[PDB]
Amino acid sequence: HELKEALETLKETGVRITPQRHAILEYLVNSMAHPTADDIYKALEGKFPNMSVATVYNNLRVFRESGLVKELTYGDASSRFDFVTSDHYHAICENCGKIVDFHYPGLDEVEQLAAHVTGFKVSHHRLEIYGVCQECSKKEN
Amino acid sequence: AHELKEALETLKETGVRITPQRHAILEYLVNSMAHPTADDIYKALEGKFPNMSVATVYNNLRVFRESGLVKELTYGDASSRFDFVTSDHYHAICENCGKIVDFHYPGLDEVEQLAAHVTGFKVSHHRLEIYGVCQECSKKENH
Numbered sequence: 204h205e206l207k208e209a210l211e212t213l214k215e216t217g218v219r220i221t222p223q224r225h226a227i228l229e230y231l232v233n234s235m236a237h238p239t240a241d242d243i244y245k246a247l248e249g250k251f252p253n254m255s256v257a258t259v260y261n262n263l264r265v266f267r268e269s270g271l272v273k274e275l276t277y278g279d280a281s282s283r284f285d286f287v288t289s290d291h292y293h294a295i296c297e298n299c300g301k302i303v304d305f306h307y308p309g310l311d312e313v314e315q316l317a318a319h320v321t322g323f324k325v326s327h328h329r330l331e332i333y334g335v336c337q338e339c340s341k342k343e344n
Numbered sequence: 345a346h347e348l349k350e351a352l353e354t355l356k357e358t359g360v361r362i363t364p365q366r367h368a369i370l371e372y373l374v375n376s377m378a379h380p381t382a383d384d385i386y387k388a389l390e391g392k393f394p395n396m397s398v399a400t401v402y403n404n405l406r407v408f409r410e411s412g413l414v415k416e417l418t419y420g421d422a423s424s425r426f427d428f429v430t431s432d433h434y435h436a437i438c439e440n441c442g443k444i445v446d447f448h449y450p451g452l453d454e455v456e457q458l459a460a461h462v463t464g465f466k467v468s469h470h471r472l473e474i475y476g477v478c479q480e481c482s483k484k485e486n487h
């Protein structure tokens with residue numbers, strides 16, 4: 204569950220889970236578009252007397268610093284905000300079934316080309332690399 | 345094995361005759377743990393085949409390399425080794441309607457090389473799944 208995992212990230216990164224923060228995350232997880240701060244404000248202000256466009260931007264900054272949101276900029280336009288779903292990279296042993304997680308700094312080139320050729324709007328990716336782990340390789344010479 | 349069956353299908357589709365010798369070499373490659381030399385293949389099979397020479401082994405490996413079934417691993421002066429190839433796969437997957445669209449990309453060499461270094465794995469092949477929203481779903485969502 205995406206909201207549950209976002210809240211876990213906040214707790215882990217020491218961010219207070221305020222009602223406004225919860226509501227902004229909920230909005231972001233449920234929205235398909237990349238909203239502006241004004242969009243978020245318009246949607247939520249009716250339930251938060253002390254919410255302002257400033258308060259929305261301030262929270263979005265906290266989220267960006269926690270890795271939950273990316274800020275999209277264009278020309279003279281107000282920023283838009285993309286909720287981030289994690290990518291995953293795994294090495295999988297074909298002999299013993301061992302799975303090892305690793306880190307790689309993104310696959311922008313592939314994602315950009317895939318978006319173009321398939322017409323999809325891209326969220327995130329999972330890469331599985333198959334082969335033989337160090338232990339099995341040693342065993343099999 | 346499923347791997348062998350798929351290799352035989354490739355041969356059939358590309359017009360390569362499926363001879364006993366070819367079948368035996370493919371079966372050997374599919375079953376091999378390390379990348380064999382031509383000499384390894386020859387010695388493994390020579391008992392079964394009277395007309396087999398080291399030349400016919402190399403000739404068949406060239407045919408398989410051309411068909412995309414085998415890659416040759418070269419080393420300065422030294423005898424080459426041969427790697428049976430498992431295909432990579434690239435898929436775009438729609439989170440809204442479940443649509444999967446296959447696409448082509450020319451390998452992920454930089455990622456594979458780094459992954460082997462950090463994890464210690466010897467790499468065979470990969471499957472990349474990209475998640476998003478398809479064109480059709482985006483149209484309804486208000487793109």
Ligand SMILES: [Zn+2]
Binds near residue numbers: 296298301
């Ligand atoms: Zn293993």
Ligand SMILES: [Zn+2]
Binds near residue numbers: 479481
């Ligand atoms: Zn769709």
